[PDB]
């Protein structure tokens, strides 16, 4: 149920693990919905329904 756009799709270049509640656990070759992109860490959502921060270094602009 997609009401409208707000971010984009970004692929994970590398894997990571959520060491705190402010962050998330993601793997390379996965794609995530960004929500905020104005700083060093972007607010995205996993396909399982979980929101938090991940480093922009492992994120890349996916063409869809």
């Amino acid at each position: 149920g997609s009401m409208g756009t707000a971010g984009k799709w970004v692929l994970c270049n590398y894997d990571f693990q959520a060491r705190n509640s402010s962050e998330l656990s993601v793997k390379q070759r996965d794609v995530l919905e960004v929500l905020d992109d104005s700083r060093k860490w972007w607010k995205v959502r996993d396909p399982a329904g979980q929101e938090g921060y991940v480093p922009y270094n492992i994120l890349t602009p996916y063409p869809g």
Binding site: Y14, F16, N20, S21, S22, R39, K40, W41, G52, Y53, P55, Y56, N57, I58
Partner: peptide, 12 residues
């Protein structure tokens, strides 16, 4: 070199 400078307004 992943994990850049610490982000503002955390979830904790």
């Amino acid at each position: 070199p992943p994990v850049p400078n610490p982000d503002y307004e955390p979830i904790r």
